[PDB]
Amino acid sequence: MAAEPLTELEESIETVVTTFFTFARQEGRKDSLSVNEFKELVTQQLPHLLKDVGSLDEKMKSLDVNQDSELKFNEYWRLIGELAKEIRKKKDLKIRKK
């Protein structure tokens, strides 16, 4: 009918952009992740990727290279990279993973 099939990448990026949009809309500006907003993301999902969702605030200060406490899309985005890393980088390391 209608709802034109986007490409695999387009789709996959839209999929994270929408999730971003919701988690960005929670508090101040559907445009930045605030810290509580961020903590909600790691608390709500991230079951097996980024364990120690407690020490988020460290990660936040790392993603937010400027430490302005607006994690803009591009700053927040960092997380998705690290996620995409952790898939294999369970360590790198010792007592790693096959």
| 11 Cβ contact partners less than 8 Å away, ≥ 6 residues apart | none
74 part of the interface to a second copy, by CB under 8 A: yes
Residue 13 CA to residue 78 CA, distance in Å, equals 13
31 is annotated as contributing to ligand binding: no
30 part of the interface to a second copy, by CB under 8 A: no
Please say whether the beta carbons of 78 and 60 come within 8 A. Answer: no
29 part of the interface to Ca ion, by CB under 5 A: yes
Residue 53 CA to residue 36 CA, distance in Å, equals 12
Q: Residue 23: which of Ca ion, a second copy, none does it interact with, CB under 5 to 8 A by kind?
A: none
Residue 4, Cβ density class (10 Å: 0-12 exposed, 13-18 middle, ≥19 buried): exposed
Binding-site annotation, residues for Ca(2+): 32, 37, 64, 66, 68, 70, 75
Summarize as ranges the residues that interact with a second copy (CB under 8 A): 1-4, 6-10, 12-17, 19-20, 45-49, 73-74, 77, 80-81, 83-85, 87-88, 90, 95-98
Summarize as ranges the residues that interact with Ca ion (CB under 5 A): 24, 27-29, 34, 37, 64, 66, 68, 70, 72, 75
